């Protein structure tokens with residue numbers, strides 16, 4: 008069934024699974040035309056496919072050329088997501104294929120189930136959680152590779168950096184979701200927090216700064232203040 | 245005109261013959277039904293006064309044999325049987341007819357309702373859905389499950405309707421996933437019509453038989469199959485023009501005949517709203533949309 012608060016620790020067991028987020032697959036800018044009408048211009052997107060246990064991220068870059076000459080692009084985007092996820096699974100050795108795929112938005116369920124009919128033993132599940140994966144394009148190195156791409160491309164990351172050397176998957180995922188929630192609620196503040204200290208750098212092969220254990224505690228606290236604050240600034244409390 | 249004579253009526257029962265029904269009291273002098281129109285299938289069905297649980301009945305065609313009803317006090321139901329001695333059957337029918345112990349199939353000359361509900365239903369196809377090949381008539385009841393239901397437990401007592409599943413390899417061509425799911429023409433025209441049913445008449449036959457088993461027996465898997473076969477047509481962008489026109493007439497008479505107080509269970513809100521208002525064929529079912537809006541505007 009659905010993934011929710013009550014079966015949360017299932018993400019961190021030894022059954023391979025992946026999250027699939029499609030919120031950045033079809034991205035547009037809306038502008039006025041010379042005639043004074045409105046039109047959209049697509050920009051490159053990405054499928055966000057993440058193993059929450061290992062941190063492995065399969066970032067498929069959706070180049071704008073995908074949409075050329077196509078109609079109903081928001082509906083297509085969900086199938087295109089599903090086509091790419093199924094192609095990924097098919098490309099992995101059997102012992103690496105997921106046993107479950109959890110979609111962040113219910114509208115991906117039918118597109119993915121249809122594309123995965125060849126895999127009856129892979130459960131396709133929704134979730135009741137409001138996960139902040141849409142903010143992945145607030146991670147500079149991810150946004151950069153997406154916007155620079157001149158063709159379809161798959162790029163591999165570990166979104167946990169080397170965190171698992173020191174913390175459990177459960178704690179890595181909780182840190183990730185806090186960072187992403189912060190970035191989604193107030194990107195400017197969030198990014199200020201992460202960089203304010205020029206001495207803490209980001210390794211060329213990492214996405215986030217090389218914080219110590221103690222510095223992560225401080226950072227994590229600062230991001231929770233931000234999220235609570237923006238909740239007051241938004242709701243006036 | 246043909247006749248279904250009865251050995252007797254030992255238990256109080258509501259008897260139905262097609263869209264009509266009448267009450268027989270316990271041990272009332274009742275010896276069957278006469279003036280049944282030749283040329284159609286028919287169904288004779290039962291609901292005991294003591295246990296409205298289990299509606300049951302018998303699909304039959306008088307052109308295929310001489311059939312009678314005789315109550316079985318061991319199994320506790322009215323059973324259809326065949327009399328192979330034609331002379332003995334005629335004499336027994338003639339005796340009951342002279343003693344006026346039979347009720348008359350109450351058909352008004354101007355009423356084509358039963359024809360319209362059964363236009364494409366053929367006894368030979370019924371007998372393949374309801375497998376019991378030693379008899380020329382077919383037993384159905386409320387509780388019989390369908391083959392598709394059984395996949396999701398006795399196979400001999402199943403309804404072998406054609407399985408229809410929109411999220412199946414049969415329904416979806418590799419590489420046309422989005423195309424074939426959002427437009428089921430491939431699945432309707434190539435897989436089902438050309439492949440399985442062979443023609444639209446056989447398709448409509450099963451569609452009409454499913455509806456009638458849902459209406460007369462409250463057979464839930466039949467209702468599922470009726471809706472699915474409607475939805476497969478409505479969800480196909482490319483349907484022969486003759487099929488759309490006939491579907492509209494088919495469904496019109498089904499909706500017209502449905503008991504008003506059974507619409508809440510027998511009609512699937514989602515399928516009807518999608519079919520009438522969202523699907524490719526939302527403009528193609530004018531008679532059906534008009535009777536549905538005037539009779540069941542709630543459902544919509």
Ligand SMILES: N[C@@H](CCO)c1cccc(Cl)c1
Pocket residue numbers: 249250251312313327332333336337
């Ligand atoms: N089984 C017989 C009983 C007569 O011996 C039967 C045959 C024909 C019609 C009817 Cl009502 C019954």
Ligand SMILES: N[C@@H](CCO)c1cccc(Cl)c1
Pocket residue numbers: 261264265266347348349350
């Ligand atoms: N309900 C009445 C007829 C009204 O149509 C009735 C009585 C006796 C036999 C049959 Cl089939 C029907």
